[PDB]
Amino acid sequence: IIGGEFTTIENQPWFAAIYRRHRGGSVTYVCGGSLISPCWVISATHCFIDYPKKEDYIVYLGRSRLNSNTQGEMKFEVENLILHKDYSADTLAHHNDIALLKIRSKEGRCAQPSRTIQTISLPSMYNDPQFGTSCEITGFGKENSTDYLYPEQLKMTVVKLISHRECQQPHYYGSEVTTKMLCAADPQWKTDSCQGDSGGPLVCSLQGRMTLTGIVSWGRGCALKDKPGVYTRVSHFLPWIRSHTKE
């Protein structure tokens, strides 16, 4: 997250931290995610497309820090890694960038709700906030484009939803952005999600309720003028989500 402020998991209880185990003992951070139900975490397909082996991933809930323990945190294995079959990556755009991970503890149980671990609500069929609405993003991603390391503390910032019409302008993204994607940015171009923030949530207060409106997917650079962050439009994937979360 470029700009913004440091936060605690208490303020972002649905945030899931996803790591990948390596040959040896090295565990590195991969992407953010969101707990949509006790047994399900939603993230982005591009985070796992190159290593679709469910056994190499670890999901943490209730975690405020990147490389250290947080009281109340819970560790999970991935029982089922569901990637979207129609995922594809063009020059800039990443299509159908959405994934589901079924989690289970070593005891075979799902997440147990607490003050630091809660689910976030999904949107209704084709019901998104009005453009110009303020939403929040959370993540352990880069604080600056020139950084190679991630911040140790979880960060959050606020960006505004940009219309499809404005985002498709020539100086923005043109026809590269579709209706299955949502653009959001800071009106001053000072804050934005960045590498390391993918898979994370774009949360919007929709009719008094905190809703998972988008998933951090892509963008040209980070916090660049006329280059909004692009998010996977969750409301357009409800049928896909429902069909893969049953049994």
Ligand SMILES: *C(=O)[C@H](CCCNC(=N)N)NC(=O)[C@H](C)NC(=O)[C@@H](CO)NC(=O)OCC(C)C
């Ligand atoms: C997470 O993996 C990351 C989130 C970027 C969010 N960016 C903004 N809000 N501006 N996504 C990606 O890295 C995604 C896989 N790829 C890109 O975003 C690429 C192509 O669009 N963009 C890019 O600028 O990458 C070049 C990197 C810096 C070498």
